[PDB]
Design a protein around this nucleic acid. Structure first.
Lengths: 30, 205, 151, 262, 100
RNA sequence: AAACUGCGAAUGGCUCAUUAAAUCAGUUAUGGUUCCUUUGGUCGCUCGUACUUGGAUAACUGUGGUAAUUCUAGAGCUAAUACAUGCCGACGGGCGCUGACCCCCUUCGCGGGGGGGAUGCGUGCAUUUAUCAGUGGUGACUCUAGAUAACCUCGGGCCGAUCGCACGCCGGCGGCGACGACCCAUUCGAACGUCUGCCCUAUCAACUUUCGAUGGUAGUCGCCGUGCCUACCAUGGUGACCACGGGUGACGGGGAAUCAGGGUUCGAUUCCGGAGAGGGAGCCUGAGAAACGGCUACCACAUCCAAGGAAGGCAGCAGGCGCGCAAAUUA
RNA sequence: CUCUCGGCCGAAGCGUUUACUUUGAAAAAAUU
């Protein structure tokens, strides 16, 4: 249970870093 | 018993407060552990909420940190030299928090030997053992000896610390409370703390 | 200078001042970095708190004290004991039978940090509630506004 | 006292339980649980005083110990169990599902719910904290600590969670233009839209809420519970839609019902 | 061996006390000659010493080594032991049995 | 049945003696603390006989002591979720120091740069200290989380040698539940603080500090903040806006009687808070008591004695004496 | 009453500070 839930939130956190990277991109670029 | 309550005190205006309830269990105080120096004796006491409080009665070894190089070692405690609270407590040789105490210098010196390869606290006679000569003059490879050279670039020690190493004892400050944690841990004094406490000890004599 | 006046060593506990350094740094400047805190209710940290060399653990800017609860004001009446002052708060208490008021006052001992120097008698002070600091001191001086007549 | 109290008098009990004055000296002292005792219905009052399924406390004990009552999908045999706001009570023997939702006058209305609504519940998150090797945790209003939440969920938001898994389905953000309900103070049980929230640092922040009929009132953040996204609620509402009527309108509706039904 | 007894007023004697007469001892759980009614209570009780004097009434006294003439009321009588072992380890020890 | 183990016995009930910024009420703080239980989170995240560990002790049998007690002594047995001891797996590894060596690039070359690595050391969460950078949050942390170097108490910290119900599937795996558990959070709280508020009295005008009075520094103790205590310092702190002292046929409020309006007086008394169990004092157990239908003393009473000893605490319910103008049934 | 940041408006300072007055939310039930 800990392994699968941690892997799912790891997917969620890699996601959240991906949209954090893109938001940082239009914030810095503009 | 020993009651650390406020209602036995006189008021701010200077009037005596008339007591209205007797001594309560949560107001208690317990006798102090005058933690002497000797082979270890620690007793436990049950405290508020069912917890434990280690009442160390005598201690010999403490875990001290030399923070400029970020080293932390167990060291046998030699002797209390100065206390800011009262002079007489040094006559009884008691370990409390924020007391200045001489401890041994061997593990920090050994780490210095293994990390920088510079001698410390060796006299002009240069007395040496084969183990110490194999540690100090250890056989090197190229990457290791370059790392040791770059480390040797940063190897500077203050002269008062050099006198402490030559005498074999480093003076430090206990940062924990041994009476209610059970351990006497602290940090090695350096810089302005070190000369401040040295001139306090010289001013005492 | 004239900081080490007590039997122990006076030190800001957060700041590690004994970092080893190159001899060029030793020759250059023996300057201790200063710990300061931004305090909550729109109160500006004075420059003497950020630049001064004083050490006390009861300062609301450079100490362990946190301000929470009530914020009051008073007039400075006595500055004679060490690093704490006595202020006076005046008010009117209402008496319902006569429909009138009476003048009442209360004195408070409040901690005054060394960042507020050249404070005189009779000027307005804003204080904020904190944890007990002594037998009577419960508040701490937050800002000082001079007297009405004093320039 | 020398320790915690275990009894409770009827006249010192919370008034929204609607207990009598001559039935006894003692009220049901609620057990400790996910809700405060000032803000809960014990299961004995719900089963005996509201639903009338039992006549005495012995019959409440006799029903609960036969394992018929579920609170949030969990069989509970403690008759003084604290059941609170947004709370799902399932009686599978009679096939009934109730939600404890506050009434307009400040009491716990028994609101019968359709059984697929009894699978989820709404929770107001009380705090966010990161612990034990970088794992975030929610704590909600009914003390359900939920680890690994959505990073956009902040304090004072609300979450819809599935009761069988205990895991978050989907959340509502606390913002103006949203539907909420009052859980405390004088305006308790009123439903309306958040107009604005005013900040008072070091103190309580005050929220203004406008009713569907244009009635404005205010509370604190500790008494707001966001129940809808925009205007549509995420739950079924009681027979009154959360609109407080004045005593004149209540009298007029009572006389109208008397005239209509004779 | 001497294993205990009672003086002329019935009080038992404890192992630690080395006086002649009676002592008032604050006794608690685990001590002999005392059984506590509540958990963690102490009571002050009268305890007789270990020294045998002229002021004893009964001397509880346990033999270790047998003589020659068998006493008509102590050794010739034969009494079994009831309620043998219950734990499995006690079963294996008391009959010297293997693990299988 | 008995007994061991666990829980409760710190609630309830009684009374109003003490108590005059004390209690208490409203208002706020714990960013300064603890918290049985309930509810949720967590419990192969540690790289180091287990297909089950050890010694007893009741109950029981048997023998006794004292005038006397809910007094117990000795000898035979026998259990555990009592008391202790203690694994294996997960377990294959991974991450940092330490690095015998090995490889590559540059270099005529010396020399410089970049990689792989056996042997050794440490590793999880709690505890203590020091250092470094700055996932989520606050109005503000010396917050939470992270990284590094170590520590980790024998009067020792967690890392399940426990029970029940149905039994079923590929010699082995298993579905519910009960007792557990260090640490978080929640609930009931509790405890120390903030602001304002009380009757009479000056035939009480100065009080407080040698023996802490007001503040500072370092510590001790305490669950924590603090003269709470100690040592060293400074001479402060309260007061005609009534301090300080004395009195009260003074527990405080919610409230009650009376009253045009304003007011006067009452509130021991069932609800909330406090205090105390003849008076003081000190404890054990416990999450919680300075507990009294717990213990240990002294003081005052007072019971049974075989004269050695033993046992007490109705301001609980009835009841009795006494007291009084004054108040009920041993259901 | 306004200069800056964000979608005519929201944040930031206010404005010498109060007393006063009106409103809002907190002020246990029982009792009235």
């Amino acid at each position: 249970k800990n392994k699968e839930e941690a892997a799912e939130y790891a997917k969620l956190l890699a996601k959240r870093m991906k949209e954090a990277k893109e938001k940082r991109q239009e914030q810095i670029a503009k | 018993g020993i009651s650390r309550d406020n209602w036995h005190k006189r008021r701010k205006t200077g009037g005596k407060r008339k007591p209205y309830h007797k001594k309560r269990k949560y107001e208690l105080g317990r006798p102090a552990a005058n933690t002497k120096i000797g082979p270890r004796r620690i007793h436990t006491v049950r405290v508020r909420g069912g917890n434990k409080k280690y009442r160390a009665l005598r201690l010999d070894v403490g875990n001290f940190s030399w923070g400029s190089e970020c080293c932390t070692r167990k060291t046998r405690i030699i002797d209390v030299v100065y206390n800011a609270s009262n002079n007489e407590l040094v006559r009884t040789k008691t370990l409390v928090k924020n007391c200045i105490v001489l401890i041994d210098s061997t593990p920090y010196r050994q780490w210095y030997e293994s990390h920088y390869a510079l001698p410390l606290g060796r006299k002009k006679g240069a007395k040496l053992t084969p183990e110490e000569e194999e540690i100090l003059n250890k056989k090197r490879s190229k990457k290791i000896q370059k790392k040791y050279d770059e480390r040797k670039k940063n190897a500077k020690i203050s002269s008062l610390l050099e006198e402490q190493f030559q005498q074999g004892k480093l003076l430090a400050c206990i940062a924990s409370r041994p009476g209610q944690c059970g351990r006497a841990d602290g940090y090695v004094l350096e810089g302005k703390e070190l000369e401040f406490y040295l001139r306090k000890i010289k001013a005492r004599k | 200078a004239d900081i080490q006046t007590e039997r122990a060593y006076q030190k800001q506990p957060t700041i590690f001042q004994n970092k080893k350094r190159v001899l060029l740094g030793e020759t250059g400047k023996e300057k201790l970095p200063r710990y300061y805190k931004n305090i909550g209710l729109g109160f500006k940290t004075p420059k003497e708190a950020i630049e001064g060399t004083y050490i006390d653990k009861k300062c609301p800017f450079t100490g362990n004290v946190s301000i929470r609860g009530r914020i009051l004001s008073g007039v400075v009446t006595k500055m004679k004991m060490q690093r704490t002052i006595v202020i006076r708060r005046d008010y009117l208490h209402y008496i319902r039978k006569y429909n009138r008021f009476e003048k009442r006052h209360k004195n408070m001992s409040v901690h005054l940090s060394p960042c507020f120097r050249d404070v005189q008698i009779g000027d307005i002070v804003t204080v904020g509630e904190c944890r007990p600091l002594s037998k009577t001191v419960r508040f701490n001086v937050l800002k000082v506004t001079k007297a009405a007549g004093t320039k | 006292a020398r320790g915690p109290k275990k009894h409770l008098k009827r006249v010192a009990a919370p008034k929204h339980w609607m207990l009598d004055k001559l039935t006894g000296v003692f009220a049901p002292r609620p057990s400790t649980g996910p809700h405060k005792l000032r803000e809960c219905l014990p299961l004995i009052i719900f089963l005996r005083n509201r639903l009338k399924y039992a006549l005495t406390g012995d019959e409440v004990k006799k029903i609960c110990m036969q394992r018929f009552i579920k609170i949030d999908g969990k069989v509970r045999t403690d008759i003084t169990y604290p059941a609170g706001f947004m709370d799902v009570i399932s009686i599978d023997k009679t096939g009934e599902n109730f939600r404890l939702i506050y009434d307009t006058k400040g009491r716990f209305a028994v609101h019968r719910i359709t059984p697929e609504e009894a699978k989820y519940k709404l929770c107001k998150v009380r705090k966010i904290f990161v612990g034990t090797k970088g794992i975030p945790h929610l704590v909600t209003h009914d003390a359900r600590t939920i680890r690994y939440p959505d990073p956009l969920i902040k304090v004072n938001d609300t979450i819809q969670i599935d009761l069988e898994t205990g895991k978050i389905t989907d959340f509502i953000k606390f913002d103006t233009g949203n539907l909420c309900m009052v859980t405390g103070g004088a305006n308790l049980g009123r439903i309306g839209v958040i107009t604005n929230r005013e900040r008072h640092p070091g103190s309580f922040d005050v929220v203004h809420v406008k009713d569907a009929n244009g009635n404005s009132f205010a509370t604190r953040l500790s008494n707001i519970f966001v129940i809808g996204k925009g205007n549509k609620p995420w739950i079924s509402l009681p027979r009154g839609k959360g609109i407080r009527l004045t005593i004149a309108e209540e009298r007029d509706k009572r006389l109208a019902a008397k005239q209509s039904s004779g | 061996r001497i294993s205990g007894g009672n003086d002329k007023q019935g009080f038992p004697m404890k192992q630690g006390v080395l006086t002649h007469g009676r002592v008032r001892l604050l006794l608690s759980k685990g001590h002999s000659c005392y059984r506590p009614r509540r958990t963690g209570e102490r009571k002050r009780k009268s305890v007789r010493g270990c020294i045998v004097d002229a002021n004893l009434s009964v001397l509880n006294l346990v033999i270790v080594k047998k003589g020659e003439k068998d006493i008509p009321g102590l050794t010739d009588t034969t009494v079994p032991r009831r309620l043998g072992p219950k734990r499995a380890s006690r079963i294996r020890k008391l009959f010297n049995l293997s693990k299988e």
